[PDB]
Design a protein around this ligand. Structure first.
Ligand SMILES: CC(C)S(=O)(=O)NC[C@H](C)c1ccc(-c2ccc([C@@H](C)CNS(=O)(=O)C(C)C)cc2)cc1
Ligand SMILES: N[C@@H](Cn1cc(F)c(=O)[nH]c1=O)C(=O)O
Length: 259
């Protein structure tokens, strides 16, 4: 059968090709996870169709109805066979879907407009002049909402009460907000995205400080799927053959624009 892959528009993992109007099917998209999908499919021996998740969400569970949205929802309710995306491995997700060993490491990080007098989360937490926010749904938001760490708790308590809202609906919105706010907004986002943006014109943002946590993205399958095992073996093989490194370099650094 043709494997249905759910994924999400997020640079440089999955992007629309420049002439995507005149192209169709999987050929409409480019990026790290596009390449990774091709590799995994080659190693597991399956045909596949790339589909952009309907609600443009990563995956969150409603506290009241217990219903999952986003890519995770697509997996749990039988809409997709596999998610190949920068989907963070988390405990609550692992309880309802299966993850491969991780294919890329990351941690929550801080993005500033160059010139901003901020070097750490503690720095942010100690002041109010510079606003700061996260993506409105996903593992970063959850990290802050659930954290028992003093500094991070202080930051969450600030963020959920800030007027107007400091949360954004896409990474693009967060980056744009950094660039337009003349140093008065800092954006908390996954280090991988931060590092990508740092390598792109107009070269006016930077990652500062260490990461706030350490985790990974994994390939996800519906719980108890037969695809789970071969997909995991493929991730291991791609890791050991240096393919994951080659792809990371390909999409992040090989054509860097900021030196
Ligand atoms: C959710 C967490 C439990 S976690 O993210 O899974 N682990 C946390 C821990 C600090 C950690 C975080 C990230 C990494 C890490 C290390 C390597 C990789 C890639 C490059 C290869 N993954 S692999 O499994 O080692 C490989 C042999 C295929 C991806 C993630 C390893 C350990
Ligand atoms: N990977 C996350 C989604 N996600 C993406 C980002 F770019 C980010 O900065 N924060 C975040 O939670 C998830 O799987 O929920």
């Amino acid at each position: 059968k043709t494997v249905v892959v759910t994924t999400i528009l997020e640079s440089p993992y999955v992007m629309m090709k420049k002439n995507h109007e005149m192209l169709e099917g999987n050929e409409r998209y480019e990026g790290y996870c596009v390449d990774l999908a091709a590799e995994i499919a080659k190693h597991c021996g399956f045909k596949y169709k790339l589909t952009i998740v309907g609600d443009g969400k990563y995956g969150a569970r409603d506290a009241d109805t217990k219903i999952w949205n986003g890519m995770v929802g697509e997996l749990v309710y039988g809409k997709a066979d596999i998610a190949i995306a920068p989907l963070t491995i988390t405990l609550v997700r692992e309880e309802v879907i299966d993850f491969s060993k991780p294919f890329m490491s990351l941690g929550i990080s801080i993005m500033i407009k160059k010139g901003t007098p901020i070097e750490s989360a503690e720095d942010l937490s100690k002041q109010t002049e510079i606003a700061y926010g996260t993506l409105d749904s996903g593992s970063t938001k959850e990290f802050f909402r659930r954290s028992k760490i003093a500094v991070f708790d202080k930051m969450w308590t600030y963020m959920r009460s800030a007027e107007p809202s400091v949360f954004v609906r896409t990474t693009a919105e967060g980056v744009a907000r950094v660039r337009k706010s003349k140093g008065k907004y800092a954006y908390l986002l996954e280090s991988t995205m931060n590092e990508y943006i740092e390598q792109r014109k107009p070269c006016d943002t930077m990652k500062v400080g260490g990461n706030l946590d350490s985790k990974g993205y994994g390939i996800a399958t519906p719980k108890g799927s037969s695809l789970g095992t071969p997909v995991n073996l493929a991730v291991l093989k791609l890791s050991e053959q240096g393919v994951l490194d080659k792809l990371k370099n390909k999409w992040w650094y090989d054509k860097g624009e900021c030196g």
